[PDB]
Symmetry: C3
Subunit: 224 residues, 3 copies
């Protein structure tokens, strides 16, 4: 069933619209390129001053707070990388609004006690809620939240892998059960209210996407 | 050995040519972004009215028929996703023709009888045969067919994986033997006449690509 | 810690700057798209006449020499593919200089003596040192060198994988130990002086990147 109620500018169009979608596509790719490399000036430049991001392991965070705890995680040996897997844009020219749709694999490297190294690879879709500064013409992201689609445990040596009990996996939504369970082993409190490939929060996510493209305020804060 | 007989517009060039290649690149990415999310209005918008697509499990299908059977598959629990892996364009400005070259991984999630979950990941290259509406200037894809390069079985828990006999794999071309064999277990009749990294259909595929860029009709229907 | 001393044009900007970053992004993607398909005219067109590239298995090579030994490798059954994973650009408009940052997975298919097939998948970042021809306006890459971030052994059938001793892996920098060790088994002499996610050559790589963007000659030749 098609989750979109309407169509937006997404292919072809005018040169101005093509270059707006190009600009928004670059913002999206800035998360994998800049966060993975700790290029924090570049990473901060993607966002509005009042931006909020959501992850499994942080929940909602204002961007500057997110950067602080990301640095802390990296200092403690946390090793999250991203593989971008296909990026397109929904553009609403008269609202100065856009949604960046960036398919990705979150690929996080863990150890389990020579210790067993493993990745958890989660195929997901980052949704960038972007707006255009009428003065500057510049695009910036105000919100980033993800759909989580499927995940897997990846042996690093091809022989050894960790073990997760059924009960350990059961509290997480299907789509990020291994990623949540592994991050929980590091001590993080995991957000269980993130959208997957089906269900209530999937519908909600598309509703907020269309609200944004219609020019409204959105409500991505789903615990209150 | 270089499979191209000639060079086309593929880097640099005029702003018009850069924006034409950008527009075609977006069409390509629409298959992973829109099909994986069941965004059917968006997916249909990529194609001409008379478009045909080829897959391992469907063979050649008119696009609207392809969408119908894709919906049916998804309703029956079929779970194909795509990871886009590098997209460039060959442009023929005076013919209003272009070829979109999109590297990808088809990543299909299966079960084998707690049941063993596994992916088959097939590295492939989608070829989008695109044309420009002289009135509108809009680019649309008339044909999509793939090169299949290599594949593998991916354990989801890192311990358990299915088993395929040599005979089960033997009828498929090298490049999609695991993908074909696994899809056949679902009941699909698999097209065995799809191009891989070498051989007769590889040459044929490049021949039809250059025919398209030269302005000709192409012959991608390889059973008659 | 942020490895960049300064900011460059990387998002938004003028249409001219957006189209310059687009053009450079295409050059980057030409390595995965054209080298994997042996499209040698296309691949050669990415580079300046005096270009040099660095890989694990070749060390530094002038591009035309690199193409010769790549053809030889492919004739001997070498099977390297690339998955592009996110590409952005740092642009210095007044210097006519740019750095292409292309995240990728090198995915090389090997056999070990029915023989065990396996991939080594190395997440890496290609750095393309690009310059703009003032006459033509065309962008070309003068240098390509990579950061190597992490790697893994990938079973092809989901059951069998090769074994590497600790001593076999120990001489390689963390980030490409499996890739280096496997390529060494083919007979290649492996460059051990390539940058990873931390340390002296990581800092050096960012230093040379900023030198390039400042208009200087760079020194990427790290053995003399
Ligand atoms: Ca604009
Ligand atoms: Ca609404
Ligand atoms: Ca709320
Ligand atoms: Ca155009
Ligand atoms: Ca011909
Ligand atoms: Ca025919
Ligand atoms: Ca230009
Ligand atoms: Ca300097
Ligand atoms: Ca030197
Ligand atoms: K990609």
């Amino acid at each position: 069933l098609d989750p979109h109620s309407k169509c937006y500018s997404h292919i072809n169009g005018s040169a101005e619209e093509l270059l707006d979608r190009l600009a928004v596509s670059e913002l999206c790719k800035g998360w994998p390129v800049y966060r993975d490399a700790s290029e924090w000036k570049n990473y901060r430049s993607l966002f509005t001053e009042d931006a909020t991001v959501w992850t499994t392991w942080s929940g909602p965070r204002p961007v500057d707070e997110f950067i602080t705890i990301s640095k802390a995680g990296k200092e403690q040996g946390v090793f999250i990388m991203h593989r971008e897997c296909g990026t397109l844009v929904e553009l609403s020219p008269q609202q100065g609004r856009a949604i960046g749709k960036m398919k990705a694999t979150i690929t996080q490297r863990f150890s389990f006690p020579d210790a067993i190294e493993f990745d958890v690879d989660c195929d997901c879709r980052f949704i960038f809620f972007c707006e255009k500064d009428t003065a500057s013409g510049a695009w910036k992201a105000k919100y980033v939240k993800l759909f989580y689609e499927k995940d897997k445990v990846v042996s690093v040596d091809g022989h050894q892998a960790p073990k997760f009990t059924k009960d350990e996996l059961a509290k997480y939504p299907q789509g990020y059960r291994y990623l949540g369970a592994a991050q929980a082993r590091l001590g993080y409190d995991i957000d269980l209210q993130l959208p997957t490939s089906s269900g209530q929060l999937w519908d909600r996510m598309y509703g907020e996407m269309e609200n944004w493209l219609g020019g409204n305020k959105v409500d991505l804060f789903w615990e209150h």
